[PDB]
Symmetry: C3
Subunit: 359 residues, 3 copies
């Protein structure tokens, strides 16, 4: 309430859970505050599964982006006349078009699987609508939805046999089954259909204090259609991502591992700062323009989805490179700041670092 | 408490006279907050009797006309030009907001019927017409302007502007002499205007996507016509023969406003926490298939449907029955065994039972 | 009674000193539900006295500047670059939201008038400004950070940061102004991807003895394309008149720059309604798509239109020789549509011999 921007790991409602994993949905952005009126049509989700488990055939009414935080996975993606399976490592992300049926296996025999989904509902702003093939209990099948009558006309079978075979959740699969599910899969390496790794192209910001990898529409067609960019950022224990703002981009920053705090600058003439402590599970939101600083307690990693990516431009307010402040003319530097121009131009050359520094 | 069926009843008569009708379907978001994303789509029927003309008029809304039946001459004006078009069943053309046009039923015996997808430009889901044609209990758009502008404007005294243009019917009886003159020169549609950027296109002047002994599914994506590319709409025409079935299928991302042209039948829609929404279908009736919702449609008599599909680009339709595009029968052997009670072998055999595709016997 | 005219005084003042000001016309949509689709567009006027300088700032809205009068030096910053532009009457430049820039009146006598169409990126109709300008009346955006981030970020003791950076329009010297003039490119001819374009560079779409109508569009210029906007500068001669015309699909935000005159708009509410208002420098009005509009001029009258939903717009006239859409109606239909005769209608339409603008 003292801060609207920081959605705590608790504020994730839990959709479904079993002895094999859970799908948890974040709090609807525009509810927390009227101020996030534009993110009303974007949802976050966390898929987590123990080893040798299977999220069964399912589709929804939302364009998905899955960003494999940790673990090894086999995502099998059904078209109507084709099917294509993919092995997924950390930093692999792929777009799941609304309507697409697909299932997710954790292939690692020890490691937990952890997947961060950005969802865009296409039917009503911010409402997700899932149709399970696995007509389990309490919830019957999407096929249960039809009538004995129609199900017969269609499948060309007595209802007794359909009811038996088809109608009568994340389940447990045998070690041998995951071999089969896998053996055939394609791997990442900016493709179309296949998955692509956030990190498998040089980072845009790299130094002794952190890494900044980021895939934009100008660099991946999957992302173009939705106008999003997906980024991963490492800030090494006891350091700093330097003050910066995104020209036009709104970020959903999520925390995969580490601890730390962020400082956001916001609000007429009443610039107010927004602090919060960061832990795994936690989200915050960087509305375009609002500048932000990120400090790491332990080894902190972040996963951000920028909305309105196309032509976004991230300007820093400190360090050597991309310090827009230092682009100001000397005479104008004089007026803007109490200090003299040779007194500004020297304090800006005090940080020899760029993008990241020390606490 | 089925929000998806808009029975004919839900049409409001914008205008009626001895010569024709113009109906406007209920705002979709007025039915239910399910349809907040059909907010800015309106449907209208246009029916007019032989040898009648909807006089010049434009509207602050992009229109996609589909002639359902009868024979029309559609004249379209531009700031500086004019082009005539004779239209039959299945002929579809986009008329952009501001486009002055007029539409006469050139057939002698038969009525003319037309389904219109209106996309208002100025204020969500609210169209406004402008008439050149004027009366007295409805002065024309030019009546709008003051004397002082009308005289400056037209460089005529009010006495004659009033007499010649304004005063002393938005659908009027017209002669044979007149309707032949309107139609002379005017162009038809073809195959090499099934992707035309200008003229009308026929839904059926290229082969259907799905077709067997029980039904026919014609569909024009934006891919196959630039006119539908601006508004990201698709228009399909679907015939389901008496005692047959449009097999269970969903759209991946496209919302569809379905209208009934001729025939009777009924639909079953799976929604939400899982729910069957059904109802009988008669001509005039409209229902909505939300993206991802598996729909089935069943015909009692020879049935014809006109869908417009909002969010058309990248829309895959994935069927749940029969050989072809049956997504269920693409699940890796063992997952079928885990997903469905059945053995993988039992799943595979049942899916093979229906050897038909897209449409089937009921 | 007429919700279309926004009198000059519906402009709220965001800031004002003895050097310039910044006004922000009230929300179109707060005026009326009628203008819902304009909810996300804001109008601003920047005025500034000679030898002044709106300090470095950025805003969460795409800015389309039209310079109404004055001379100026709009200086634009990227993360790692600076280009500056000498601007004059007609010069329009787009600033992406998140661009830091600073504008200066480089004239010694005439004030600087800019008309901004602002498009918030964050929350519909909501300008968040971010003053890099460090005072107490408006504490620098840098203020917001805690001593600790600040000391680490610049790697400097806090007492050299309070001192130097923290502790909006301002006066400036001739040698200072001459500085910003020294190496600063101009407009000319447009389609130049990132410079300024003059609204009167290309020839006017309509021009005669009674007015000029200049209009750049997404077609003619990539910068407009993105925001799908057109930008026109209509001139109308004293005792002359822009003949009744409607835009097919374009919602125009018309802003009277100088002169006086009146607009007739034809909306509804048996249906057709004449919406009227006298016009004067600062007055704004809205012309919804499809709504016919004539503009009279009491005195020589310039207008700056921001076309919204610009691509594929066709403006149709309803009087005069050219682009007159009524004269395209077939002869037997004129007979029918109008109470008079094919022939009588043909004559009345041939009576106005001028096109676009005419005498009153």
């Amino acid at each position: 309430q003292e801060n609207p921007f920081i959605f705590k790991s608790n504020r994730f409602q839990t959709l479904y859970e079993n002895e094999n994993g859970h799908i948890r949905l974040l709090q609807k952005f525009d509810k927390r505050s009227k101020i996030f009126e534009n993110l009303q049509n974007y949802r976050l989700l966390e898929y987590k599964s123990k080893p040798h488990t299977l999220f069964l055939p399912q589709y929804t009414d939302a364009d998905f982006i899955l960003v494999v935080l940790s673990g090894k996975a086999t995502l099998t993606v059904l078209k109507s006349n084709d099917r294509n399976s993919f092995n997924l490592e950390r930093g692999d992300a792929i777009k799941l078009p609304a309507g697409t049926i697909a299932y997710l296996a954790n292939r690692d025999d020890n490691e937990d699987l952890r997947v961060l989904d950005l969802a865009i509902p296409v039917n009503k702003p911010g409402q997700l609508q899932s149709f399970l093939l696995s007509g389990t209990q309490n919830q019957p099948s999407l096929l249960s939805g039809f009538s004995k009558n129609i199900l017969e006309a269609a499948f060309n079978t007595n209802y007794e046999e359909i009811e038996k075979v088809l109608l009568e959740v994340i389940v447990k699969v045998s070690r041998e089954q995951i071999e089969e599910l896998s053996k055939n899969a394609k791997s990442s390496s900016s493709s179309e259909s296949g998955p692509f790794n956030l990190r498998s192209r040089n980072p845009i910001y790299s130094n002794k204090f952190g890494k900044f990898f980021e895939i934009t529409p100008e660099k991946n067609q999957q992302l173009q259609d939705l106008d999003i960019f997906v980024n991963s950022v490492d800030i090494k224990e006891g350091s700093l991502l330097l003050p910066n703002y995104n020209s036009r981009a709104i970020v959903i920053v999520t925390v995969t591992e580490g601890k730390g705090d962020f400082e956001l600058v916001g609000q007429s003439k009443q610039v107010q700062l927004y602090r919060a402590k960061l832990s795994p599970g936690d989200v915050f939101v960087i509305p375009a323009g609002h500048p932000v600083a990120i400090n790491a307690s332990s080894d902190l990693n972040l996963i951000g989805f920028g909305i309105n990516a196309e032509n976004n431009e991230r300007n820093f307010l400190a360090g050597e490179e991309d310090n827009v402040i230092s682009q100001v003319e000397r005479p104008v530097k004089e007026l803007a700041f109490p200090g003299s121009s040779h007194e500004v131009d020297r304090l800006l050359k005090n940080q020899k670092q760029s993008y990241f520094a020390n606490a």
